[PDB]
């Protein structure tokens, strides 16, 4: 239905990385030769890399993501090489909140810190955000598009989760709300839910066993449900996130019941088939009336009600199966195909540290 959540990238002001870095290189290496000149060169290339990674808000393709990924790898590889733990290298990174646009009475919501850990955290945020945007753009009617989305949602999930676990010790002060552990923990779960949904779409497209499709859908329902519960009392994410999560929780439960009902029919459990279709119809009716402007469930609704009408007609006239109450049905199982991908530098392809000989 192409109703996937993605995250906007954080904006940052342009910073001259070169000057504060080579000024230390000229200090520690009084050699007026080529080692000082090659570091100074690599420092010039690092400042250029920052401008390419976070200065141009463009290009939802892998080249832009790999540039972001490469710049994250480079910064992580530099914290030990340069005395950044002490504030003798003056470098201030200013980043704006990804979500809080700010009232027109106090400007935008910005934070400036002289911290590499702050820069790492915001850069990793944009890696995850851009990955979520690339995943959300994939054609899910194509197997390669599905695989790209599955990989990128799991990456985004693991990167938001890495920020959750490290942002506090990395920052001296308290972060903006967008990178705060509560926000990125919820984003991590949203991306994990969407990765699981992609596996459900993959299973449906490949015509897998309905028993398996039901367990994949049921697990996606659990992830969407957990995510929307973390948004229930928070207004930090954009307005459309909460209704979309609530809708997807119910759509996934309905998909689980629908595919479980097909299994029931195949087993000649006609009463159970009707009970599960009635539950799917109820869930889809609730989504159609509450979240109408966020999802389109008309085709699914017609499929359910065509199946439920035929089931009831034949059961009343032929089989006379008792239709069980929902609470007397056995629970649908759960199958999780997704994991939050850990961030292990290097996360970029063919990475080469610019300060490796140091």
């Amino acid at each position: 239905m192409a109703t996937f959540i993605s995250v906007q990238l954080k904006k940052t002001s342009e910073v001259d990385l070169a000057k504060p870095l080579v000024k230390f290189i000229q200090q520690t290496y009084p050699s007026g030769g080529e080692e000082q000149a090659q570091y100074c060169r690599a420092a010039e290339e690092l400042s250029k890399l920052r401008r390419a990674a976070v200065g141009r808000p463009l290009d939802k393709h892998e080249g832009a993501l790999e540039t972001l990924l490469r710049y994250y790898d480079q910064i992580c590889s530099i914290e030990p090489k340069f005395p950044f733990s002490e504030n003798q290298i003056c470098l201030t990174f200013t980043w704006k909140d990804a979500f809080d646009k700010g009232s027109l009475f106090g400007g935008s919501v910005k934070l400036a810190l002289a911290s590499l850990g702050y820069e790492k955290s915001c850069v990793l945020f944009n890696c995850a955000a851009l990955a979520s945007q690339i995943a959300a753009e994939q054609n899910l009617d194509n197997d390669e598009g599905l695989k790209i989305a599955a990989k990128h949602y799991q990456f985004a999930s693991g990167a938001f989760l890495h920020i959750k676990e490290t942002v506090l010790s990395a920052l001296s002060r308290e972060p903006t709300v967008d990178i705060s552990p509560d926000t990125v923990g919820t984003l991590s779960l949203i991306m994990l839910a969407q990765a699981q949904e992609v596996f459900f779409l993959k299973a449906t497209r490949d015509k897998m066993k309905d028993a398996i499709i039901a367990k994949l859908a049921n697990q996606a329902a659990d992830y969407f449900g957990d995510a929307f519960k973390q948004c229930q009392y928070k207004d930090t994410l954009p307005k459309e996130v909460f209704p979309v999560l609530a809708a997807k929780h119910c759509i996934m439960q309905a998909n689980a019941e629908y595919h479980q009902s097909i299994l029931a029919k195949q087993q000649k459990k006609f009463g159970e088939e009707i009970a599960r279709l009635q539950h799917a119809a109820e869930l889809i009716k609730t989504v159609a009336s509450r979240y109408d402007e966020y999802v389109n469930v008309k085709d699914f609704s017609d499929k359910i009600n065509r199946a439920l009408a035929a089931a009831k007609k034949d059961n009343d006239f032929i089989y006379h199966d008792r239709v069980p109450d929902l609470k007397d049905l056995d629970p649908i199982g759960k199958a999780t195909l997704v994991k939050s991908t850990p961030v292990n530098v290097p996360i970029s392809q063919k990475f080469t540290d610019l300060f490796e000989k140091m």
Binding site: K147, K151, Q154, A203, I212, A335, L337
Partner: peptide
């Protein structure tokens, strides 16, 4: 079933 899940798991390659 169980092997159907295993083949789906080995997909992201």
């Amino acid at each position: 079933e169980d092997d159907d899940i295993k083949q789906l798991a080995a997909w992201t390659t």
